[PDB]
């Protein structure tokens, strides 16, 4: 109930796997490859595949 698996401040959103964000409400960035997919999720997918 308390152990996030990355759990080492790995991702830019360390507590969850943010697959996508709303670009209109996006402010800090964290959207990758000219769409609403995030930097963290894109990194995860590219590293996996």
């Amino acid at each position: 109930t308390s152990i996030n698996w990355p759990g080492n401040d790995r991702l830019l959103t360390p507590n969850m796997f943010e697959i996508k964000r709303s670009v209109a409400l996006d402010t800090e960035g964290f959207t990758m490859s000219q769409c609403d997919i995030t930097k963290d999720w894109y990194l995860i997918q590219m590293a996996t595949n």
């Binding site: 670009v23 996006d26 960035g29 959207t31 990758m32 490859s33 000219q34």
Partner: protein, 49 residues
């Protein structure tokens, strides 16, 4: 023969590049531009500031 064939509406590459921004002339783009200088495009920086 002397006319640039890449300045054509059937330039599928440019067509894809333009349709990634939207269908309007008013684009709030978010793009990621790679480093291309050969000395630093693949350089592996070690510890330091």
């Amino acid at each position: 023969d002397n006319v640039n064939p890449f300045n054509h509406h059937r330039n599928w590459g440019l067509k894809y590049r333009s349709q990634l921004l939207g269908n309007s002339r008013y684009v709030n783009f978010h793009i990621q531009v790679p480093q291309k200088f050969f000395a630093i495009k693949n350089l592996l920086l070690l510890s330091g500031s």
